[PDB]
């Protein structure tokens, strides 16, 4: 539980910062839209 | 390197009405190619069916239900494994809906028919009985050691 | 043991909670598919044995809301079908996520 | 489904049931309950004989 | 009478608690059935003679 | 499957089902833990009782 | 195994695990203390004999 | 009792992210090699380095 | 690097990290407290038994 | 256990503008050099100079 949810807290912080920069810079000339990418899992990478 | 077929064609129940109407309605040619498979389905009877690229269907599967007399004898041996035994009679077989046989569902699952609250009231009862017996064991110990103490 | 029955169950429940937490953590991972674990009853010898034994995971393969993004390198396969990937070990892996560069 | 497409419970225990027979396959109602294996193969090439 | 009564009753209560605990343990196991233990009288002159 | 381009596949995780499952897991863990507690305290009572 | 860089690995411990180990250790030490006390009163009975 | 043994378990913990360019941890299988103050080759599973 | 004028730079203390660290480490605080208590129980048992 | 360590992160400034003609902060790594009443040479990234 705790580790995954808190890691997600950090991930959300990153995504929110990205969108916040986007909306901030909506009127910077020559600015390019920014976006964030994420990655967790399939059948687990924890070996037990 | 193959083999080919031949058929007979007939036109039952057609009628020619002397006034104005004209159409064909009937769909029957029984041949198809060896279709390719994208489907497989399980129904409320225990059957397993599949359908194929030739828009035709193929089936192989039926799941067996059984009636038993002393069902407690069908004890779980782990992994919900009934041990079906004389102590329960035998497995008298029939498929879902065979009159004296219930109905099936697929894409669904049956609860563990326990309830936690009921189990906890029962636990209260049982632990209190256990308390009583514990105190009574020690009561008998005390009396018997008293008899040993008198000497 | 009654106690073991409970302990085993508690332990299993911890595993269930872990998988649920991971489900939330992945709740926006692109192409991801949800997970859950499977229990079993540790009957052995007679009566109830010791409690529950647990080795099983369930993953669903329904396709989520396939959202449109407009990049000329964003792809998704509706219904079964997967992409093939490799690493420096010469391995072969399959995946459903389809954002590329 | 097991790696061979046999229907199994999680312990690999093989779902016993009646198989279909002939072409078009039809279920054998008096039969040994046996593992149903999902076809890895196309169906019958039943060509035409009537219309 | 004597020790046997109380020890047997103690273990009878604990036994029913065993199945209660196993029900709790498998309270999520699908299709799982709720179990209970069967009890009887230890008749020896008294109907609770040895518990 | 057919290919879609300019699009991507979402997570098939439903947050609502997971929230309810989360609380039901709370109940399951609580049942296990409290059965443990009752049995342990009353057992310690017996282990002490001799 | 492959390495992590700018990352650390937690310990292979769980609070619930250690509290379970605590319960079993409680049972162990209580058992040893009771096992003593019984034979200890038997010894004091021996001290009354010899 | 008749038991006399040590044990250390190779099972893995959670992989955690710090970002320190000298925090290095081992996935799955392996152990770290170091030389002590005397030339002895010493070994650890800890990932904190400076 | 390069210098800025009329600007300032603030710390890395994010509440999300630090409060959750406080939560987990307080869990550890109570864990060691529980251990302490049970050790006290052990001695009190051994003290009262004789 | 025993505890021995103090280690720090050095990611860059949560950035803020003031326009005061003496607020100076360094983008990217690097530190300042400051001298005390005795000349003791100390190092800091705080940019509030007056």
Residue numbers in the entry:
A (entry chain C): 4 to 51
B (entry chain z): 253 to 403
C (entry chain 1): 1 to 101
D (entry chain z): 102 to 152
E (entry chain z): 1 to 51
F (entry chain 1), G (entry chain 2), I (entry chain 3): 354 to 403
H (entry chain 2), J (entry chain 3): 52 to 101
How does the study describe this entry?
The flagellum is the most prominent extracellular structure in bacteria, with a molecular weight in the hundreds of megadaltons. Structurally, the flagellum can be divided into three major components: basal body, hook and filament. A ring-like structure formed by the proteins FlgK and FlgL, termed the hook–filament junction (HFJ), forms the connection between the flexible hook and the rigid filament. To assemble a filament, flagellin monomers are secreted through the flagellar basal body and hook, and polymerize at the distal end.
Using our short-flagellum cryo-EM dataset, we were able to determine the structure of the intact HFJ, anchored to both the hook and the filament, to 2.9 Å resolution. In this structure, both FlgK and FlgL form 11-mer layers that separate the hook protein FlgE from the filament protein FliC. These components—FlgE, FlgK, FlgL and FliC—are aligned to form a continuous protofilament along the 11-start symmetry axis. A total of 11 FlgL subunits form the distal HFJ layer beneath the filament, while 11 FlgK subunits form the proximal layer above the hook. As previously observed for the hook, the protofilaments in the junction can be structurally classified into two types: extended and compressed. Substantial structural shifts occur in FlgK, FlgL and FlgE subunits when transitioning from the extended to the compressed state, while the shift in flagellin subunit FliC remains minimal. Notably, FliC shows no substantial shift, suggesting that the HFJ prevents mechanical force transmissions to the filament. We propose that the HFJ functions as a mechanical buffer, leveraging the elasticity of FlgK to prevent mechanical stress from propagating to the flagellin filament. In conclusion, our results indicate that, while the interface appears relatively robust towards mutations, the integrity of the FlgKL interface is crucial for maintaining motility in S. enterica.
